[PDB]
Amino acid sequence: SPRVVVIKKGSNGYGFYLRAGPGQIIKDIEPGSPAEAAGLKNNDLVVAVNGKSVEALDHDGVVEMIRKGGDQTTLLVLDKQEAKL
């Protein structure tokens, strides 16, 4: 399920980790972080950064796109749609 998450960088960054999924996925959102306030979710899959696709881009390339944006990042993400029932 897709959405656009704008996050303003704080004094200690955005407050999430980025690593390869089972693409690059969000992990370990820090409580009280800009990422948490922006509604980013653990296991969100990053499909674009600042309007640019991350297709076939490696981990370092995705991280660099995020850093190049300076004090803000706009992530297009797909939530993991696996429900525990």
C-alpha to C-alpha distances, 32 to 24, 36, 51, nearest whole angstrom: 23, 6, 26
Report which of 41, 46, 72, 42 is spatially closest to residue 57, judged by C-alpha positions.
46
C-alpha to C-alpha distances, 34 to 16, 48, 55, 69, 83, nearest whole angstrom: 9, 19, 26, 15, 25
7 contacts 14 by C-beta, under 8 angstroms: yes
Query: How far is it, in rounded angstroms, from Cα 25 to Cα 60?
Result: 13
Q: Which CATH architecture has domain 1-85?
A: Roll (2.30)
Instruction: Return the half-sphere exposure (C-beta side, CA atoms, 13 A cut-off) of residue 47.
Output: 12
Burial of 57 (0-12, 13-18, 19+ CB in 10 A): middle
Domain locations along the chain: 1-85
Query: How far is it, in rounded angstroms, from Cα 74 to Cα 85?
Result: 31
